[PDB]
Amino acid sequence: SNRLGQLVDLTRLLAYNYETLMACITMNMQHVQTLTTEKLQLTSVTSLC
C-alpha cells in the first residue's frame, strides 16, 4: 500500500518499454508454451516492487 504510486509507475514503465521493443520485431510472435522455461524467484518481484 505504501508503494502504491511507485507500483503504478512501474507498471506504466514496463508497458512502455515492452511496446517500444515490440516495435522492433520482424518475426510474428506466437503465444505457445515451451519445453524449457525461465525461473522467476518472487523475491525478485518483492525487490522490484
Partner: protein, 49 residues
C-alpha cells in the same frame, strides 16, 4: 490513515499543495479549519512609517 482513507494519489506538478486538496476531502471541523488557516496563512503587506 487516521480517518481511514486511501494513502493518496498525488501528482508531482499538481497545482494544489496537499493541504489544499485535503482541506475538502476530510469531514471534521477542527482539522479542516486548521488546514484552511494553513492554506490561507500569508503575510500582510502594509506600508508603515
Amino acid at each position: 490513515p487516521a480517518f481511514g482513507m486511501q494513502r493518496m494519489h498525488y501528482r508531482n506538478g499538481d497545482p494544489q499543495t496537499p493541504f489544499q486538496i485535503a482541506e475538502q476531502q476530510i469531514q471534521n471541523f477542527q482539522v479542516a479549519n486548521w488546514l484552511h488557516f494553513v492554506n490561507n496563512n500569508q503575510f500582510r503587506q502594509v506600508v508603515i512609517d
